[PDB]
Amino acid sequence: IPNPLLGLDSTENLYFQGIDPFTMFEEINVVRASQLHRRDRFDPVPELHSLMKEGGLTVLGTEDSTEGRTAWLATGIDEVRQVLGSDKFSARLLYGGTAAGITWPGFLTQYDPPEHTRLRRMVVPAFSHRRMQKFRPRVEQIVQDSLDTIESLGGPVDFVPHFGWAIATPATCDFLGIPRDDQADLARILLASRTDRSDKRRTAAGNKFMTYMKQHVAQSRRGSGDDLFGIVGRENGDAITDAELTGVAAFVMGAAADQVARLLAAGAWLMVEQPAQFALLREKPETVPEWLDETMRYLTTDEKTHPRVATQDVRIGNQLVKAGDTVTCSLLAANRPNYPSAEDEFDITREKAEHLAFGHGIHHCLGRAMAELMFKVSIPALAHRFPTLRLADPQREITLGPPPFDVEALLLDW
């Protein structure tokens, strides 16, 4: 029971007779983790910078009950790696007990070994470095088309739709063999499922997409395409279900496509904030072999991992994480440990900049090679195309939305 006589926070004060206390505990902690992972331009916010100084593992929240659950945040790189690499944490148990089945088939984030291992192993070959090599020429074409469209319009141009989304939509669609004629309507439907203010209309749109995708999966899984479905379906036959394939594909075009768009927008913004450094990339790329890793480290566009649930008591760094506790890992804190300082600042010329922008352990980003391909093609292509790229209005702050790193609009001229 919150006490609204004492405090002002709306989220913490929400109460009505018959409210679920556990739900409120979970939701408040999610809100806290989210607030901590907003950004101050490219930087951690002061609240996270402060929290980081406290130690490598801190309490986000601790339930009203005697012997109730604690939600933890891991910020130290050692603690983050330890939690994410441990077999004593579950991802599945975040969504229900041992009894509860899979809620969203193909949502790998939600599986534990052994079934996480089998499903990921089945879908892995479609996401390989070799497979991305084969995909590069198509990505290069997508990027040039987008730059052509930008140039043809004239500045100012909003790089969120015209760069991030203009690349992410066709790239993710092409990867799944989605016919060119279907892609614009699908992107529109996905927009509605991500943003519509009516939850009812949001669900209708989501269902419309999943219906299309289920049909596409059934059509493609036994055919001869180089799309995800042909590859995985030909290789695995009936061992992978239509629902599992639908789930994987939907993540690629849904959530993951949003991530790529957000990364590309954040990248374009960094280029106009650090033009001398990216001039080095376009004119002498050989002198900056590790530019990609440094950029990923600095940007950390996926600030935090999904909470993991302790399956038994476990020592993390110095603390005791009790069975049933959750730990959320701050990839942002792990990647920016020395913020602020000269050494933390973006430096394109740095030695092999090591980072956890794509996570760690068994759940590490399946699409890392794809995301990297996207970025390694798009950013240099943009730099060469528009060397004079700048903010249309240097006086105006860039508006950032809720995490993950969410550039709402990026008006650039050249």
> Can you say which residues are annotated as belonging to the binding site for heme b?
116, 120, 306, 308, 363, 365
Footprint of ligand HEM on this chain (CB under 6 A)? 108-109, 120, 172, 251-252, 256, 259-260, 263, 301-302, 305-306, 331, 357-359, 363, 365-367, 370-371
Nearer to ligand HEM, 70 or 300 (CB): 300
Residue position matching structure tokens 């007990």: 97
Question: Judged by CB, which is closer to ligand HEM: 366, or 389?
Answer: 366
Question: Residue 197: how many CB atoms within 10 A of its CB?
Answer: 6
Q: Which is nearer to ligand HEM, 24 or 298 (CB)?
A: 298
Taking the complex as a whole, the smallest distance from the CB of residue 301 to ligand HEM amounts, in Å, to 5
Shortest spacing between CB 6 and ligand HEM, in angstroms = 35
> For residues 396 and 165, what is the distance between their CA atoms, to the nearest angstrom?
22
- Binding site, residues? 116, 120, 306, 308, 363, 365
Q: How far is the CB of 59 from ligand HEM (least distance, A)?
A: 20
Distance CA 329, CA 324 (A): 16
Could you tell me where the DSSP H helices lie in 10-92? 10-13, 21-35, 46-53, 77-85
The contacts of residue 364 (CB under 8 Å, 6+ apart) are: 84, 358
For residue 9, the minimal CB distance to ligand HEM (Å) is 27
Looking at residue 84, its amino acid is L
Residue 327 Cβ vs ligand HEM, minimum distance, rounded to whole Å: 11
Backbone angles phi, psi at 359, to 5 degrees: 85, -160
The Cα–Cα gap between 324 and 313 comes to 8
- 8 Å CB contact between 271 and 389: yes
Which CB atom, from 24 or from 220, has the smaller least distance to ligand HEM?
220
Report the residue number whose CB is nearest to ligand HEM.
Answer: 367
Q: Edge-to-edge strand order for the sheet containing 308-310?
A: 57-62, 70-74, 326-329, 308-310, 89-90
